[PDB]
Amino acid sequence: NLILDFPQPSTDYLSFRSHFQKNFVCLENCSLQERTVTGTVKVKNVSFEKKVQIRITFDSWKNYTDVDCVYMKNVYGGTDSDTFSFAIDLPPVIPTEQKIEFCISYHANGQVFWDNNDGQNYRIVHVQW
Template sequence: FGYVCNCECAPFLCSVLAISMDMGFGLPAHGHLLRPPSPKVRHRTCAKKRVVFADSKGLSLTSVRMFSKKEEKPHEEAPVSLRLKSLRWVGECAQGPRLRVGFAQPCADLQAFQQRVRHSPVLLESCCVTKRALVGTVRVWNLSYEKVVHVRITFDSWRTQQDVPCAFLQRCCGEPDTDSFSFHVGLPEALKAQEHIEFCVKYLPEGHSQAFYDNNDGNNYSLHVCN
């Protein structure tokens, strides 16, 4: 058995032939030794997606931003109206007040109140009690430019009394030729249920020697201690 090859690959072929003979393999068919391997069909493989969390890489899971007081924009609060439509809890012990009003809201019947305004120089318009204060509004005739309006109140059955000045309110509605005033009366720390807690409204226009009063037709406006 002889095989002669004059090409430049002779040394390589001879080595392959010797190895094949030693191992007992037959000689491959002529022309198959130098045939390049057939190209393999590459199949596209889909890479598996993985979810990586920030903390696994040593990163923080939260981001904190500090704001200074200069950066914070203050919230604008709407003005608090003392009109009846805003006093939805009048006469009730809402928000824990220690007192409750003992009379009907003056302007609950708006038409009746407007009729009374035409005949009374001063009238309590609205009233409510909070945890620490008695607040409300008063309507007066515009008899002069300068007006002095007070709420006269007692917490001990008129053994003592105090006059609390009322503040002028810019006119927003109401009868012509009338002005509105608001009041805010702080409540004492101790309130006794057996005492008469009452108040009335006093109005003194400039140039008048006698003051006008609204004392609830002689009965005064009473307040009761909540049980």
């Protein structure tokens, strides 16, 4: 009934790297299971202290929620970037007319960086299936 309306950003490496180098934050993977959306976010390692959040709407941006992401230790990651994970429960019912979208914010060293997917956000759409 719901599906991701975007390719996994990490699949197209050249696009992923271009966005990540420009914005210093980029969604890496995302999956929709049951009524929960989970995923991973790559951020440039700008400073020790970081705050990474998903800003998500389930009602066409009438409202939104900021959800904290959690740092993921990665033995195989480099020292230039860090990985954060998120898990967000969907509301029990979302009417078909309502848009579901999210974007990502990243605070470090007094600055804020955004992944808004080239101004479209990351969309989840309603389907017949």
